[PDB]
Ligand binder design. Structure first.
Ligand SMILES: Cc1onc(-c2ccccc2Cl)c1C(=O)Nc1ccc(C(C)C)cc1
Ligand SMILES: Cc1onc(-c2ccccc2Cl)c1C(=O)Nc1ccc(C(C)C)cc1
Ligand SMILES: CC(C)=CCC/C(C)=C/CC/C(C)=C/COP(=O)(O)OP(=O)(O)O
Ligand SMILES: CC(C)=CCC/C(C)=C/CC/C(C)=C/COP(=O)(O)OP(=O)(O)O
Lengths: 230, 228
C-alpha cells in the first residue's frame, strides 16, 4: 500500500480545542506544536518524504497583536523542545513564503534549524510562513518576466515546468514538489490559498478532528483513506 | 441567498451508465440532461455563473472512440438544449484552449455563444480543453510579451493584473471567482480546476453520480454553502 510522498497540512481548530479546556487560543497553538512533532516523527518512520505545513498565512497577520506576537515567539523560545529531536530523527527543516519579512528572531530560529538539519536525508518538514498561493504565483510570474526582459531566458522557455522552478517549492527535490495528499482538520471544507499550483492534482482529506488531537493514529487513518482512493 | 458563482466538476457518468448495463457514452448523454436541469434551476434561483469542467486536458487520455463521441455531443444535440437555454435568458460562454477542439465542435460552441451573447441571466461557462496550470502559463506568455513590448512594466505584475489575463477575464469582475465548487461521485480532488480563481472557494462533495444530480441536489449544495 502506497505512502503519500508529500503531504500538505492545514492545521485548524487550535482555538476550539483550547476553549473546550477553558484555555485561551495560544494554549491550543502550543499543543499544535506537540501534535506537529508527533505527526512529523511518525510520517518520517512511515516513509513520507515531505510535509508542508500551513504555519502562517498572510491573512494570519489580521489576528490580535498579542496573539501574533505569541505565535512569532514560539520557534524562538521552544527551539530546544523540538529541533534537536527532529535532527536526531534525520528530519530536514525548510521554509517557504516571503520569509524576509518575518520578525528577525523568528527568521533566525528558523534559519538556525535549517542550517542544523540541511544535510539530513529523511522527511523534509516544510513550513509555509508569510505564505499565500496567489502571491507565490505572482512573485514567480514577475521574476520570469524580468528574466525574459534581461534575456536570461527567452519567451519560448515559458512553460508549466519553468513556472514550477520559480515557485517557493523550487527548493524541494523536483519529484516531491507537489503534495499527493492535502489534509485539513476541524471540518472546514475549504481551500484557503494553500499550494494552489502544486496541489492542483492532490487527493484531499478532511477530518472533524481538531489539530492538537491529530496524532499518529489520525495520520494512519488519513493514509488508509488515501490508499482507498483511485 | 445563493452562491453567485458555482464551479461544477461532473463525475460518475460511467458508473451511472454501468449500473444500467450501458456503455460510458450513454452516461455522458444523461450528463447533458442533468446539466440542462441544473442550469435552468440555478438561473431561476439567482445563481449568476456556473462554470462546468466539460473537458479537461487529462480527458484526452480517454479511448479515441470515447473522445470522438464526446466532441460530437454539442454538434449532434445543439437543438435539444441551446434554443431552450436561450429562451431561459442563459448566456453561454467557454474558457480553455479551444484551438485543439475539432472544427465542428468549435463551431457548435461559437454558434451558441453568438446566439446568447446579449442574454442577462445565468452565465453557463464551459471549461473546454481546460487546465488551471495551462491557463496561468498562457497568462504569463501574454504578460511577458506586454512587458517586452513595454505596454506594461515588471512592477505592474500584481495579483489583480494576473486575474485580468486569465480565461475568466470575460466574466464580470465580481463574478470571476467561484463561491462554491461541487464535485460529484464522492471523488475528493479538484483536478486542476480554477486553482487561482477558486483559491478561497467553499468546497462541496457528494456521492451522487452526475446524471442523478438534479434541482433537489443543487438545493442541498446551496443549503450546505449557506451553513458555512
Ligand atoms: C514541532 C516543531 O518542530 N520543529 C519546529 C521548529 C522548527 C524550526 C525552528 C523552531 C522550531 Cl520549534 C516546530 C514548530 O512547531 N515550529 C514553529 C511553530 C510556530 C511557528 C510560527 C512562527 C507560525 C513557526 C514554527
Ligand atoms: C446541457 C447543455 O446545454 N447547452 C449545451 C450546449 C452548449 C453549446 C453548444 C451546444 C450545446 Cl448542446 C449543453 C451541453 O451539454 N454542451 C456540451 C456537451 C459536451 C461537450 C463536450 C465537447 C465536452 C461540450 C458542450
Ligand atoms: C507550525 C505550528 C505547529 C504552529 C502552531 C499553530 C499556529 C500558531 C498556527 C497558525 C494559526 C492557525 C491557522 C491556527 C489553527 O487554529 P485556529 O486558531 O484557527 O483555531 P479555531 O479555528 O478553532 O479558532
Ligand atoms: C458538458 C457536458 C454535460 C458534457 C457531457 C459529459 C462529459 C462528456 C464529460 C467529460 C468526461 C467526464 C469527466 C465525465 C464524468 O464522468 P466519468 O466518465 O469520469 O465517470 P466515472 O468516473 O464513473 O468513470
Amino acid at each position: 500500500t502506497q505512502v503519500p510522498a508529500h503531504i500538505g497540512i492545514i492545521m485548524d481548530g487550535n482555538g476550539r480545542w483550547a476553549k473546550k479546556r477553558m484555555q485561551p487560543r495560544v494554549f491550543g497553538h502550543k499543543a499544535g506544536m506537540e501534535a506537529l512533532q508527533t505527526v512529523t516523527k511518525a510520517a518520517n518512520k512511515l516513509g513520507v518524504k515531505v510535509i508542508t505545513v500551513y504555519a502562517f498565512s498572510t491573512e494570519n497577520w489580521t489576528r490580535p497583536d498579542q496573539e501574533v506576537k505569541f505565535i512569532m515567539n514560539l520557534p524562538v523560545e521552544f527551539y530546544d523542545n523540538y529541533v534537536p529531536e527532529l535532527h536526531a530523527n534525520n528530519v530536514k527543516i525548510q521554509m517557504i513564503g516571503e520569509t524576509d519579512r518575518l520578525p528577525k528572531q523568528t527568521f533566525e530560529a528558523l534559519t538556525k534549524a535549517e542550517e542544523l538539519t540541511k544535510n539530513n536525508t529523511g522527511l523534509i518538514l516544510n513550513f509555509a510562513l508569510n505564505y499565500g498561493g496567489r502571491a507565490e504565483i505572482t512573485q514567480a510570474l514577475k521574476l520570469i518576466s524580468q528574466d525574459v526582459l534581461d534575456a536570461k531566458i527567452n519567451p519560448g522557455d515559458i512553460t508549466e515546468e519553468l513556472i514550477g522552478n520559480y515557485l517557493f517549492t523550487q527548493h524541494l527535490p523536483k519529484d516531491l514538489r507537489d503534495p499527493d495528499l492535502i489534509i485539513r482538520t476541524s471540518g472546514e471544507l475549504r481551500l484557503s490559498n494553500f499550494l494552489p499550483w502544486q496541489g492542483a492534482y492532490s487527493e484531499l482529506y478532511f477530518t472533524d478532528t481538531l489539530w492538537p488531537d491529530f496524532d499518529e493514529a489520525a495520520l494512519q487513518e488519513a493514509i488508509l483513506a488515501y490508499n482507498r482512493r483511485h
